[PDB]
Amino acid sequence: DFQSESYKDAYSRINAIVIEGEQEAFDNYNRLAEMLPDQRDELHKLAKMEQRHMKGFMACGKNLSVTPDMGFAQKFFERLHENFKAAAAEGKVVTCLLIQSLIIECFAIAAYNIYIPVADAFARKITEGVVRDEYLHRNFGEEWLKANFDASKAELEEANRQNLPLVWLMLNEVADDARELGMERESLVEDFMIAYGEALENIGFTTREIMRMSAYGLAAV
Ligand SMILES: CCCCCCCCCCCCCCCCO
Ligand SMILES: [Fe+2]
Ligand SMILES: [Fe+2]
């Protein structure tokens, strides 16, 4: 029942959170575009994709006659967003890449795919389209970081350590509203640990290293 006051209420926060992610992602990729001149056009492309996602999700909100609680969503993203900004200012492209392209993208992939089977038919269509783009964004980050892994390794570990716990906290924060929308926490935690562990394996981390990196997240709750 997409019309109930309890579905509308949870949707107000989830829709707003998703919209903030897409909008925030737009700025992250534009900022990366400055920091990685060799990848400037490509990163600009990924930015414009995020813009379209934002519009797509604003339209999912209107379809269910829900005003997004943007204030709640700004606060949801705040810590992780300020960490990205500070990294950009420091010239730390690797940290900015791991945040947005790996931690974050992955997060949207796991949650979005879980949302698809329980989503109203308008939003299901919008979401199927956005998730397709997300695979690309994650692949871009994996490809760059695997190509530059030795130079990048130590900063990735450090960035993972500061930022993965922020995503776990975001995960806990959304859990109850997500359930109302028909999305189980257990699937979301699992699909995220899997997606991010595989991304870490794919760029070059060992079993012990992935366990260490993953554990910084799981331990924060
Ligand atoms: C209406 C969308 C339903 C899915 C909501 C997922 C719950 C919280 C995850 C939000 C993650 C936002 C990340 C967007 C980043 C874009 O590249
Ligand atoms: Fe996106
Ligand atoms: Fe994205």
Numbering used by the authors: 11 to 231
Quote the paper:
Cyanobacterial aldehyde-deformylating oxygenase (cADO) belongs to the superfamily of ferritin-like di-iron proteins and contains a di-iron center. SeADO belongs to the di-iron protein family, with conserved sequence of two EX28-29EX2H motifs, in which six conservative amino acids from four helices (Glu32 from helix H1, Glu115 from helix H4, Glu60 & His63 from helix H2, and Glu144 & His147 from helix H5) act as metal ligands.
Following the analysis of the extracts together with the observed electron densities, we built a long-chain fatty acid (Lox) into the structure of WT-HP, and a long-chain fatty alcohol (Lred) into three other structures. In the WT1 structure, a Lred ligand, which was proposed to mimic the substrate aldehyde, was modeled in the substrate channel according to the electron density. This coordination mode suggests that Fe2 is the preferred iron for substrate binding. The water molecule, located near the di-iron site in the Y122F structure, is displaced by the head group of the Lred ligand. The residue Glu144, which is located in helix H5, changes its rotamer and is not coordinated with either iron atoms.
